[PDB]
Design an enzyme around this catalytic site. Structure first.
Site, PDB file in Angstrom:
ATOM      1  CD1 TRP B 133       4.421  43.373  85.166  1.00 29.71           C
ATOM      2  CD2 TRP B 133       4.403  41.562  86.419  1.00 29.71           C
ATOM      3  NE1 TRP B 133       3.998  42.328  84.372  1.00 29.71           N
ATOM      4  CE2 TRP B 133       4.002  41.215  85.135  1.00 29.71           C
ATOM      5  CE3 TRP B 133       4.478  40.604  87.416  1.00 29.71           C
ATOM      6  CZ2 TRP B 133       3.673  39.935  84.805  1.00 29.71           C
ATOM      7  CZ3 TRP B 133       4.151  39.316  87.083  1.00 29.71           C
ATOM      8  CH2 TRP B 133       3.748  38.974  85.805  1.00 29.71           C
ATOM      9  CG  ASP B 214       8.751  38.456  90.126  1.00 27.10           C
ATOM     10  OD1 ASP B 214       9.093  37.539  89.344  1.00 27.10           O
ATOM     11  OD2 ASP B 214       7.855  39.306  89.940  1.00 27.10           O
ATOM     12  CE  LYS B 250       9.915  39.480  79.759  1.00 25.38           C
ATOM     13  NZ  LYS B 250       9.103  39.741  80.993  1.00 25.38           N
TER      14      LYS B 250
HETATM   15  C1  LIG Z   1       8.769  41.683  87.081  1.00 29.01           C
HETATM   16  C2  LIG Z   1       8.116  40.561  86.336  1.00 29.01           C
HETATM   17  N1  LIG Z   1       7.800  39.387  86.911  1.00 29.01           N
HETATM   18  C3  LIG Z   1       7.235  38.341  86.310  1.00 29.01           C
HETATM   19  C4  LIG Z   1       6.909  38.432  85.013  1.00 29.01           C
HETATM   20  C5  LIG Z   1       6.214  37.310  84.190  1.00 29.01           C
HETATM   21  O1  LIG Z   1       6.770  36.932  82.963  1.00 29.01           O
HETATM   22  P1  LIG Z   1       6.577  35.563  82.203  1.00 29.01           P
HETATM   23  O2  LIG Z   1       5.268  34.991  82.761  1.00 29.01           O
HETATM   24  O3  LIG Z   1       6.455  35.887  80.774  1.00 29.01           O
HETATM   25  O4  LIG Z   1       7.628  34.631  82.528  1.00 29.01           O
HETATM   26  C6  LIG Z   1       7.183  39.644  84.253  1.00 29.01           C
HETATM   27  C7  LIG Z   1       6.723  39.502  82.819  1.00 29.01           C
HETATM   28  N2  LIG Z   1       6.479  40.495  82.127  1.00 29.01           N
HETATM   29  O5  LIG Z   1       6.282  40.725  80.756  1.00 29.01           O
HETATM   30  C8  LIG Z   1       4.993  40.350  80.315  1.00 29.01           C
HETATM   31  C9  LIG Z   1       3.728  40.864  81.030  1.00 29.01           C
HETATM   32  O6  LIG Z   1       3.556  41.951  81.719  1.00 29.01           O
HETATM   33  O7  LIG Z   1       2.730  40.035  81.134  1.00 29.01           O
HETATM   34  C10 LIG Z   1       7.771  40.662  84.936  1.00 29.01           C
HETATM   35  O8  LIG Z   1       8.182  41.908  84.682  1.00 29.01           O
END
Ligand SMILES: Cc1ncc(COP(=O)(O)O)c(CNOCC(=O)O)c1O
Ligand SMILES: Cc1ncc(COP(=O)(O)O)c(CNOCC(=O)O)c1O
Lengths: 401, 401
Positions: B133, B214, B250
């Site tokens: 990510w 994560d 999510k």
């Molecule tokens: C694998 C993963 N970890 C962690 C996270 C972090 O999500 P959040 O901070 O919304 O809880 C995400 C969030 N992604 O969606 C929004 C973006 O790319 O910014 C994620 O896919």
């Protein structure tokens, strides 16, 4: 031998640690005068009327919970800039500002501290008043800058050391950073007088220092928000491009929802547009986007004629009530038979009083009467109700008598 | 020459920047398959039923807005630890965990990254899958550690490069840090198979590497939360003390309210008690205390029998629906006359698909059909409704045909 066997027991928060210990007490008469937090006259945590209604409309709307831009709610952002600057302002009129919704005052302060760390190429030094709000030290240190000091309070006379301030300020190396509190200085309750503010300005301008304004108490120094923002706006229009942190934690009574903002006054609309991008690259790997509730309540209030109106009536009611409590404090003091001079109590402005109690007296207070305050002798008058003013008085007297 | 004349125009967010450009489009048929965000089958942002009711009760309570402890809501904290670990767990039973409410997944990730920076005395290296990510890079870099990589995906076969992974992992220097995604790998949709997870464990344990999980998609890989947490718990009970970030962004559809948590599995209740203090000293000069709303919704849901129950029915409904959409995608592809193999589409799990489209095809898609996705070819299937599956199919075909 584990990963964390070497990690030692760090102490409780200097301020924050006061609510902790407060919580735990079994005395029915305990009072938490620790953090600047308003209690209505029953000394019950108070949620403003306009907030209660702001929540209802959001509720009614059946709003979504979708991610907000990296800079926050456009509407809250823009409405804050305005509350800071005034609608007539050239700064505001021209768009030479960038406002990012931040994690209340504390968070704005830090995005700000990390922004500087990263783009302020002229110095690693941030000069803080003596004394300042405790968290300023660590915010700034964890960010990576160095700490310095300018003389502020004078405990002999219980006020502004204007000659000493003027002296340290006059010797700050050109282009360093200096933190000034916009109004209701924390912890002292002492603010420069208009006149003084005009003079500070001159020396700031003259030394070409980067002015950093901490505006957490707007509408708390006088009961009037535009007045409270006087010093701030006087700077910018004197040609000083500042940076500022704003909190809605006390003036909206939005404490735990956390809504605030960080602004930079640049020279153009294009520069503002360039800083915005960088602020956003900085903020992304931090908490990606900020807490929507507080920003949503506040923006409906700031941007709804009737909601703002009600808002000032009630920001007026809070300042006043803090005043009746100061008054009455002094009064009972004398009535309890106090030999000391408690003039500073009603002299000081904002949420606090800087009483002068020494630590053994602060300690006895906690231990014998269940009155919780920070050991610097600062008490939050914000926290006194009609019902316990007597109790504080007495206590204060016993321990002082 | 101003303070900020040297500050240049930084680019828009790789992902986040996709909603931006999406917003601006005038095509009535635009689709935002940019960020992992669920849309119901009308492709309308969806707020779960149980959340809507969680809000009602808080509402009804007429709750205060007072500052929360530096670690967040005890109740949310404790309820998350549990969702992570299972109630039977020795880790949990024994109290050798410290859970801090954080600024959603992103924020937990960062408090975590800064905690390590500060107390992980054994290495400055964090090994990330290939690919990972996007935000993992900067979170980690801004925190101060170095970045490294372990081979993960294999685009030839559209899956896990288990021999290559096993190889890089086997050579990671003892005591470095390694980021593993708990389930629904982002961006690939490929997760180790139980068996593989057992093997990873062994090599992790064997090399004495600090495992960093994560966990942002729990209940999104299989429709079942305990199953989704399998790999995580399998590690700890194999004697691996991990660190983990959790998001409710999510699975609770709590996106913009921001609720998450960061946990460290230590060896005792006393060590946990020591790390807690330090986590809090670290968090104070950051944003002082976190956003109360999301934590409050979630904690009422997690801790209310009926609310949790409803919660799983509906976390089940979301996983399913993503499945019907994958299905149907593939189907229309063939129906549109697709010559290619779209098996990975229904092969992959979680919110995304890692389609393999090259950038000129991603670009044409945006430009000719108004379908917004990241340039790595990743699309959020999460985002497809019964009504636009046809449209995506076609589009996909045109640009591929
Ligand atoms: C694998 C993963 N970890 C962690 C996270 C972090 O999500 P959040 O901070 O919304 O809880 C995400 C969030 N992604 O969606 C929004 C973006 O790319 O910014 C994620 O896919
Ligand atoms: C002068 C000043 N600036 C900034 C701030 C930050 O307030 P907030 O982060 O709640 O917006 C405060 C907040 N203080 O009350 C709570 C505490 O000591 O932690 C403050 O006095």
């Amino acid at each position: 031998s584990s990963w964390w066997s070497h990690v030692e027991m760090g102490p409780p928060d200097p301020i924050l640690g006061v609510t902790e210990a407060f919580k735990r007490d079994t005395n029915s008469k305990k009072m938490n005068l620790g953090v600047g937090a308003y209690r209505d006259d029953n000394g019950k945590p108070y949620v403003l009327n306009c907030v209660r209604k702001a929540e209802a409309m959001i509720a009614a709307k059946k709003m979504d919970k979708e991610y907000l831009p990296i800079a926050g709610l456009a509407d809250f952002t823009r409405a804050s800039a305005e509350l800071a600057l005034g609608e007539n302002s050239e700064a505001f009129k021209s768009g030479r500002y960038v406002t990012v919704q931040g994690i209340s005052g504390t968070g704005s302060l830090r995005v700000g501290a990390n922004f500087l760390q990263r783009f302020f190429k002229f110095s690693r030094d941030v000069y803080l008043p003596k004394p300042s709000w405790g968290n300023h030290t660590p915010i700034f240190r964890d960010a990576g800058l160095q700490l310095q000091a300018y003389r502020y309070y004078d405990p002999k006379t219980c006020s502004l050391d204007f000659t000493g301030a003027m002296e340290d300020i006059s010797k700050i190396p050109e282009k360093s950073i200096i933190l000034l509190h916009a109004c209701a200085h924390n912890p002292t309750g002492v603010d420069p007088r208009q006149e003084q503010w005009k003079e500070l300005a001159s020396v700031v301008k003259k030394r070409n220092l980067l002015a950093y304004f901490d505006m957490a108490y707007q509408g708390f120094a006088s009961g009037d928000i535009n007045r409270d923002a006087w010093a701030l706006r006087h700077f910018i229009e004197q040609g000083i491009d500042v940076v500022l942190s704003q909190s809605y934690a006390k003036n909206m009574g939005l404490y735990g929802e956390r809504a605030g903002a960080f602004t930079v006054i640049c020279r153009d609309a294009e520069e503002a547009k360039r800083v915005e991008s960088q602020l956003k690259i900085l903020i992304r790997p931090m908490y990606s986007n900020p807490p929507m509730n507080g920003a949503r309540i506040a923006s409906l209030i700031l941007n709804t004629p009737e909601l703002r109106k009600e808002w000032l009536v009630e920001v007026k009611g809070m300042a006043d009530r803090i005043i009746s409590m100061r008054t009455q404090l002094v009064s009972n003091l004398k009535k309890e038979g106090s030999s000391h001079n408690w003039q500073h109590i009603t002299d000081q402005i904002g949420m606090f009083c800087f009483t002068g109690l020494k630590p053994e007296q602060v300690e006895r207070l906690t231990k014998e009467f269940s009155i919780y305050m920070t050991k610097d002798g600062r008490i939050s008058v914000a926290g006194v109700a009609s019902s316990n003013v007597g109790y504080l008085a007495h206590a204060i007297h016993q321990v002082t008598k």
